[PDB]
Design a protein around this ligand. Sequence first.
Ligand SMILES: COC1=C(OC)C(=O)C(C/C=C(/C)CC/C=C(\C)CC/C=C(\C)CC/C=C(\C)CC/C=C(\C)CC/C=C(\C)CC/C=C(/C)CC/C=C(\C)CC/C=C(\C)CCC=C(C)C)=C(C)C1=O
Ligand SMILES: CCCCCCCCCCCCCCCC(=O)OC[C@H](COP(=O)([O-])OCC[N+](C)(C)C)OC(=O)CCCCCCCCCCCCCCC
Ligand SMILES: CCCCCCCCCCCCCCCC(=O)OC[C@H](COP(=O)([O-])OCC[N+](C)(C)C)OC(=O)CCCCCCCCCCCCCCC
Ligand code: HEC
Ligand code: HEM
Ligand code: HEM
Ligand code: FES
Lengths: 387, 60, 245, 122, 57, 87, 66
Amino acid sequence: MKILKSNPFLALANNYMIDAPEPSNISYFWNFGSLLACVLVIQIVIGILLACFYIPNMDLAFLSVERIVRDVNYGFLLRAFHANGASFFFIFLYLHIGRGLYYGSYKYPRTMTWNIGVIIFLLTIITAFLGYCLPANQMSFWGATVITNLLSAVPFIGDDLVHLLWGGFSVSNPTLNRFFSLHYLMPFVIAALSVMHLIALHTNGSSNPLGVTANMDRIPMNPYYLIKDLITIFIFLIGINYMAFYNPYGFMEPDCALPADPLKTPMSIVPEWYLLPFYAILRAIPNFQLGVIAMLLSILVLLLLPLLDFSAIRGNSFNPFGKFFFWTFVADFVILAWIGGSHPENVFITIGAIATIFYFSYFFILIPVYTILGNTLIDLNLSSIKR
Amino acid sequence: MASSTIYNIFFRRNSSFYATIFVSAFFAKIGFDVFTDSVWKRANAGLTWDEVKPRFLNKD
Amino acid sequence: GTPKEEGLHFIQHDWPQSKVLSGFDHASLRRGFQVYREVCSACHSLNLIAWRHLVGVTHTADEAKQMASEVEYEDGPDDEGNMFKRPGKLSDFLPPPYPNVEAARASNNGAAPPDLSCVVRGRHGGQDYIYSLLTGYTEPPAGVEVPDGMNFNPFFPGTQIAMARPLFDDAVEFEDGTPATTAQAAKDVVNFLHWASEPELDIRKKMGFQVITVLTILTALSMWYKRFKWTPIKNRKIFYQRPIK
Amino acid sequence: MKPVSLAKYIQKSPFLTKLLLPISNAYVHLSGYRKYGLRYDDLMLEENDDTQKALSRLPKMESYDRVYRIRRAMQLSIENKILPKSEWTKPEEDYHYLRPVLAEVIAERKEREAFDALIVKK
Amino acid sequence: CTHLGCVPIGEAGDYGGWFCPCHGSHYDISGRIRRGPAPLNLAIPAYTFEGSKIIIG
Amino acid sequence: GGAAGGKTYLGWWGHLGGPKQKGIITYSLSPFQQRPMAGFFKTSTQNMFRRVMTEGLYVAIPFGIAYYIYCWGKERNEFLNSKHGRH
Amino acid sequence: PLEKMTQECMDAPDCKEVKHHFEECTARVTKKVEQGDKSEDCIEEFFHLYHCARDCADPKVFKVLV
Ligand SMILES: COC1=C(OC)C(=O)C(C/C=C(/C)CC/C=C(\C)CC/C=C(\C)CC/C=C(\C)CC/C=C(\C)CC/C=C(\C)CC/C=C(/C)CC/C=C(\C)CC/C=C(\C)CCC=C(C)C)=C(C)C1=O
Ligand SMILES: CCCCCCCCCCCCCCCC(=O)OC[C@H](COP(=O)([O-])OCC[N+](C)(C)C)OC(=O)CCCCCCCCCCCCCCC
Ligand SMILES: CCCCCCCCCCCCCCCC(=O)OC[C@H](COP(=O)([O-])OCC[N+](C)(C)C)OC(=O)CCCCCCCCCCCCCCC
Ligand code: HEC
Ligand code: HEM
Ligand code: HEM
Ligand code: FES
């Protein structure tokens, strides 16, 4: 027997990287898992170094960041790379989620994988929100103040959890200390959850664009899928390197290069761009608690997808109605993000309300109706062929 | 000579492969550094502190 | 909001540093630093730039030492308590005109001159907005009046700036010899402030070119190697011999 | 849970079927599973016990033909191309060949489930 | 100042109250806003009274 | 080892848990004998043209509608808060 | 230099419609204020005219600013 098949550690490595039966016709949209893993590794490695020059205190946090930027050797590279990798993480996460949703990778035998991915997405959102508050910028302080107050919607112990989290009466030194510690801790938990994600997925294999079984023509991972990932790796490297060397603050709002003044009230208080649609959803509901409930449901509705998709086939490669409605929903998501970005003026609130109504209608009314209609039409045509 | 000699020299054994890779990398770094230095120097004419020195301080 | 309460959209120009393979204009940088020191050192503070930063960029080491040796700083305790002044070193920051923010508020009515270290990067427009604000002082149109202590400036949000016209014609004597108009001086000040915002631009843009070139070559090689290895699968031939019973 | 369809209530009224025939024709053309030389019953999910048991009760010829069709379809999907218009799945060959077996298996399971839950009403 | 967070001057303004020369707005004697770029009135603390000493907080 | 694991649908090499196959001959060549960059441009161009002509409107319609309402909303919102809009 | 070129661009044929609107402003608003009414402020027309003039003038002068 080969050594790679005998030694337990080498056996673990082999069963997951060297000799793993995979479908023989998976497209280029199956390349984002490795991209996500590499982005996470880069983020953790760079953050470990970034923690070597940061002082977690409200009175002394901005000057430490400036010293990192303009005094340490190649500190600007570290800062820009960390920020831009954290930004690219969400782009690749959205692409992964879209790939999973479009080809129907949530309707067994792989449903635990979907739930683990949803939990990982929630943890990533929480980690990003904790991280972007650290530099004590103006939007960082004000958005932290705005977002942390959402915990007051709890009926009984509300308005006390907020003070417990703040560690006082407003955003001050203890808040920054706690946020730094939690932001340091969480990515390792995310990595462990990703390991569990991979373990859960490995027991049944991946899907294929056709949506049919692929237990007839399988090829091993290496070297056939260990090289298809290199092209995407290099393309992502090109993108991130350009963004970090020619436009580092290109994803950043102009109201982030100022020290946090607890009296200066900014004109618009918005979070970063990757969390914008949920903020848009939150502000749509006139009520307070209903808004928080809707915002949480907007991410927690991905768990209910398996039990309300009545389709005789898996995927969207042979379902025109799904092809139309998926792109319509994607456009609605983009429009929701745009509305969340802008001011809450006259026409914008109406547009946001319409977009929220459509977004919450998509996961409840549209999907079962069009799936059932497609089934009915196909069966009706197939039932009158020989006649 | 032909093309079999090239395979016989570097691309015959992995040990004679990694050494070629490393040496080629070492030379390529210097080559690319020289290229980028030359192109950046040509790009900026009359725009750096070394070429604006006589205008300001040489007159004192 | 209302156009009056949000200001006029800034004008757009072309700067040497906005290209893909261009650095700064160091002569303009030095002239802008001179104008800064001779004009806005009185009220605006730049307490994030040290004398050593200008060494090799706008001034020689001896020039920087000689210029810094004229500012008096305050040092640590003496042998018996006390605090003694110093003639200045090459590792100190530029002197702030006011000791704290409250003194600045008291001096200039109720306003507070913002620190200029990171203002260009922190404004909606950067260099264009700053230059337009500097050169955009005009008499108010009929119907709108300005109370005492305020000036009309369309590019400022609300069209009410607390400043006065800072740059008048022939305010500074340039060492090079260029005339000091309100257009040249504003351009040089904007360039110097942009440099003070991001002093690392040159090295970054010098490294990026080589990085991008190497990465492009690597990607071009990968796209070919994948097609090389994936060949015996993309070109298979499947025949079905029907299994007659 | 299971696929659902209003494919019989419409059959109850002839007028609705006559009205909906062209729409069904257009939809089935638009689905494009026939461009790969496949049949509709191949695409049905087979991961539960019922379909796994049903696939083991087909005639051997049907199983071999299904295997060849699936393999050819995946080979075509590898290179992102389709067969010429001559080798498309004709309507006459696109019949339902897996539904009756699945119906028999579901009927057996439902009968056992019915026997399972009983009561004595004196 | 409820508009952009500045320190107003009291015993002044058109309405005989607090006056903000940072943006030229006036607060009435009662403490509310009458005219100027200030959106809302002045804030009220949760103080309590104990004899001749008032505790703010 | 043993440990009496559960039930899956993948297996491993040799026993992949698929239906029995018969009479499926397969030929392939060697990567060193075939030629990369052979017929790539023609086949890729034909596939891209067919995909554009086939999927097409599926993406074209929603994105176009969204862009139209985006432009209209921006124009109307800019108009309304101006001088003449409020009247 | 900038003021002269901006004035020349203001009187240039490139921007004449916005100038016409600003003139109609000046007349009407001056009559209104000297009557004793402080309710109207057409700063929008001044914004438009100044934007047109600056766009006309700035690229011309910016080239010779060395
Ligand atoms: C099909 O699925 C598949 C995938 O997808 C295709 C995959 O993804 C993978 C997954 C593959 C992996 C890469 C495994 C991990 C990936 C995950 C599942 C999730 C991500 C997991 C991680 C978080 C990666 C682990 C990384 C960690 C734990 C942190 C890493 C930290 C560092 C590397 C340290 C950083 C460096 C710093 C800050 C300083 C380093 C120290 C120094 C040396 C500095 C200098 C100091 C000195 C000089 C001091 C003196 C030194 C001494 C004493 C030495 C002197 C010499 C002497 C001899 C004394 C698999 C298996 C898979 O099958
Ligand atoms: C890179 C710079 C140049 C660095 C240059 C110096 C690097 C060191 C040089 C040697 C590195 C490799 C060590 C082992 C060498 C060797 O001869 O191993 C042979 C066998 C091959 O395995 P097998 O023949 O197929 O199976 C044998 C099973 N029997 C029959 C015994 C029952 O055992 C195997 O190889 C099994 C394959 C998997 C186990 C090895 C994985 C790790 C290999 C690399 C380890 C060193 C990596 C160093 C990286 C710094
Ligand atoms: C293990 C985690 C998952 C993986 C994470 C990525 C790990 C990346 C480093 C290892 C990449 C290569 C993996 C091992 C591939 C291998 O088998 O190496 C041997 C090959 C030659 O093998 P051959 O292609 O079959 O040709 C036969 C040659 N004869 C025998 C005829 C002489 O010769 C070569 O392949 C030489 C080219 C590659 C060798 C490394 C040099 C380039 C990388 C330098 C280090 C930079 C990487 C730092 C960042 C990773
Ligand atoms: C009269 C003292 C004084 C002078 C001289 C002066 N500044 Fe100012 N500056 C101020 C004050 C006070 C403010 C605050 C105005 C406000 O907040 O409304 C200010 C505001 C600014 C701002 C902030 C604009 C904004 O939108 O926040 C910039 C930039 C600026 N000045 C640049 C300059 C430059 C460049 C010079 C030299 C040409 C200069 N100033 C000269 C006192 C001064
Ligand atoms: C071990 C892992 C990590 C460590 C030690 C770490 C540490 C840090 C530190 C010290 C900062 C402060 C930056 C500064 O002071 O300028 C920061 C910022 C940030 N981090 Fe991380 N981080 C880690 C992983 C992550 C992950 C996994 C994400 C997202 C998924 C993330 C997202 C962010 C963001 C968005 C910022 C703010 C960007 C900015 O400051 O410009 N980090 N992180
Ligand atoms: C954030 C939301 C996520 C969801 C909803 C999710 C869900 C899924 C699903 C359903 C699959 C199987 C798709 C199929 O077989 O057709 C999959 C595959 C995979 N996932 Fe995730 N996952 C998420 C995040 C992540 C993260 C953060 C990582 C790694 C850090 C990761 C790594 C992988 C890998 C490596 C695969 C297999 C290869 C691939 O599909 O690219 N996923 N995921
Ligand atoms: S503090 Fe803003 S105008 Fe009074």
